[PDB]
């Protein structure tokens, strides 16, 4: 009824026919919107957690604008009828892209196949905007991935210990204070020049990654709220993360929890695959480290939360936290002990790729 109402804000091109909710998203509130022509997403913005409306837009009108130049799909922005790039509606903020037609995506990594696909559509994302000045985003959350700042908030949490917690999980804690030495490898190289400022996405889970109902190809990366600078090494850390484990955060039986070379493989095959004419000697060799840092960043904020009474992540019981950094703990340590199979793929892939 006013979704009605919401939509003739914006300048849309065909008569507005039908609006329903749409999507797995978590964060946003989105609807569709049918036309008698072209289709539309239309979100509420979360502005709890995005507060700063106008440089989240400013971040990912900078970054559209780039792809859209150059011909590469992306989110399509639909201004409002007075130009603006979203729309304040009683206090809530509003925008609409184009709905990006015939696509898939997937939740869980079905197979490595997929994988790779993943990979060449962020390693694409990346090759595109090898030339935007990066400078110019707005970190839209404050030191996301500096993982020496997040190790400084693990270190308060672990400090304060509100809930007697630390005592129950001292292996677990021994094991971020034991690697303190290796969380500022990448921040290092950003702030001396060793290592290319980039456009950062931060979200690289699968489910923003459309790819083609058909072909099955890579077609979009979607979902640009948590747009930033940084090394391209956090996004492809992350992605080794949580997509070269043969089980989930938060699998309790560890034994099921591995570091696979096979996804690693796969994932870099796609990604170097797009960005060879780009990445640096510094960002290559990196590349297999950039999964030990993003997984122990990811870790450590997990047991952060453990010991401040899980008020960041949504937990479903007690321990939840814990079980989760435990998942993160096995796969560091299985890529510390496959750093030589690792290096060996990366140096393969980088030559493949030439």
């Known amino acids: 009824e006013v979704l009605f109402g919401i939509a003739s804000h914006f300048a849309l091109e065909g008569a507005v026919t039908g609006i329903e909710p749409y999507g797995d998203g978590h964060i946003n509130t989105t609807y569709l919107v049918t036309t008698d022509g072209?289709?539309?997403?239309?979100?509420?913005m979360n502005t709890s957690i995005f507060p700063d409306t106008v440089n989240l837009m400013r971040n990912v009108e900078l970054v559209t604008s780039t792809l859209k130049a150059?011909?590469?799909?992306?989110?399509?922005?639909?201004?409002?009828t007075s130009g603006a790039t979203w729309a304040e509606i009683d206090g809530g903020a509003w925008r609409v892209y184009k709905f990006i037609e015939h696509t898939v995506s997937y939740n869980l990594v079905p197979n490595?196949?997929?994988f790779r696909e993943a990979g060449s559509a962020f390693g694409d994302f990346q090759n595109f905007l090898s030339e935007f000045d990066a400078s110019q985003l707005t970190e839209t959350i404050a030191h996301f991935h500096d993982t020496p700042h997040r190790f400084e908030d693990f270190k308060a949490a672990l400090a304060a210990d509100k809930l007697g917690r630390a005592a129950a999980c001292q292996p677990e804690i021994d094991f971020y204070l034991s690697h303190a030495d290796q969380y500022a490898v990448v921040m290092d190289g950003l702030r001396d020049g060793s290592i290319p400022l980039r456009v950062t996405h931060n979200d690289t889970k699968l489910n923003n990654i459309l790819?083609?109902?058909?072909?099955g190809k890579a077609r979009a990366i979607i979902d640009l709220d948590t747009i930033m600078p940084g090394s391209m090494l956090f996004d492809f850390g992350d992605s080794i993360r949580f997509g070269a484990s043969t089980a989930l955060e938060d699998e309790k039986d560890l034994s099921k929890v591995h570091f696979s070379t096979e996804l690693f493989r796969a994932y870099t095959e796609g990604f170097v695959g797009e960005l060879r004419g780009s990445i640096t000697a510094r960002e290559?060799?990196?590349?297999?480290?950039?999964?030990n840092l993003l997984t122990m960043?990811?870790?450590?904020?997990?047991?952060?939360?453990?010991?401040?009474?899980?008020?960041?992540?949504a937990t479903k019981y007690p321990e939840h936290n814990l079980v989760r950094t435990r998942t993160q703990i096995?796969?560091?340590?299985?890529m510390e002990q496959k750093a030589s199979e690792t290096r060996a793929i990366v140096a393969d892939i980088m030559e493949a790729a030439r």
Do not use: N
């Open 297 to 313: 960043e990811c870790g450590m904020r997990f047991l952060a939360d453990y010991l401040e009474g899980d008020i960041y992540f």
């Open 112 to 114: 490595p196949d997929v």
């Open 211 to 215: 790819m083609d109902a058909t072909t």
């Open 284 to 291: 290559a060799e990196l590349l297999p480290f950039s999964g």
């Open 70 to 80: 150059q011909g590469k799909e992306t989110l399509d922005i639909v201004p409002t």
């Open 330 to 334: 096995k796969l560091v340590q299985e």
């Open 38 to 44: 072209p289709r539309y997403i239309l979100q509420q």
